[PDB]
Amino acid sequence: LDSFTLSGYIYTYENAPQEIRDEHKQNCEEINIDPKPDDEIFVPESANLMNEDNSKGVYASYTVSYNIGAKTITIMSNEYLTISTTKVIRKGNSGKEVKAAQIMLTLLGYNVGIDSSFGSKTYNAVVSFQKKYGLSADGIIGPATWDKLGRLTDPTLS
Numbered sequence: 001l002d003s004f005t006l007s008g009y010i011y012t013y014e015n016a017p018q019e020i021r022d023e024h025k026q027n028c029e030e031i032n033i034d035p036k037p038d039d040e041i042f043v044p045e046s047a048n049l050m051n052e053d054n055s056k057g058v059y060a061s062y063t064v065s066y067n068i069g070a071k072t073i074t075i076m077s078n079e080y081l082t083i084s085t086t087k088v089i090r091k092g093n094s095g096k097e098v099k100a101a102q103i104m105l106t107l108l109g110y111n112v113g114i115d116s117s118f119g120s121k122t123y124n125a126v127v128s129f130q131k132k133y134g135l136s137a138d139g140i141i142g143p144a145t146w147d148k149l150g151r152l153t154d155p156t157l158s
């Protein structure tokens with residue numbers, strides 16, 4: 001029940017804990033783009049931070065709904081982030097699809113920063129995930145990888 005919910009705090013890059021700022025910094029440098037002060041980063045409670053003050057952040061709790069027939073995945077909190085499982089994302093991309101994948105990978109235990117940028121950590125996690133589940137390990141999230149992520153993170157699905 002509780003293992004399908006991803007809770008934590010949303011920070012802006014300027015407000016984020018320094019360990020999170022450095023992770024985001026290195027992530028943006030890998031995709032050769034500059035981080036901006038208003039970049040959102042979601043830090044799950046499972047993440048090991050020594051001296052994190054939640055006051056600078058905003059609490060959020062995410063769950064996943066995968067509509068197989070509609071080929072869509074919805075990330076649910078107070079807001080609803082929906083993406084098409086026909087979209088292909090890979091290292092270098094940034095946006096809501098990347099965020100959705102990061103949230104799902106984090107629920108399955110992968111260590112990726114949830115900042116909407118597909119850098120090296122996301123790539124490694126995707127390859128690992130693909131190897132674990134018998135998918136081609138090309139590091140690209142396409143239809144087959146979205147489907148597997150969706151089935152594993154939506155509790156109503158087998």
Ligand SMILES: N[C@@H](CCC(=O)NO)C(=O)O
Pocket residue numbers: 088136138139140141142143144145146
């Ligand atoms: N890894 C992809 C394979 C299809 C694709 O877009 N390749 O570039 C998937 O998960 O379907």
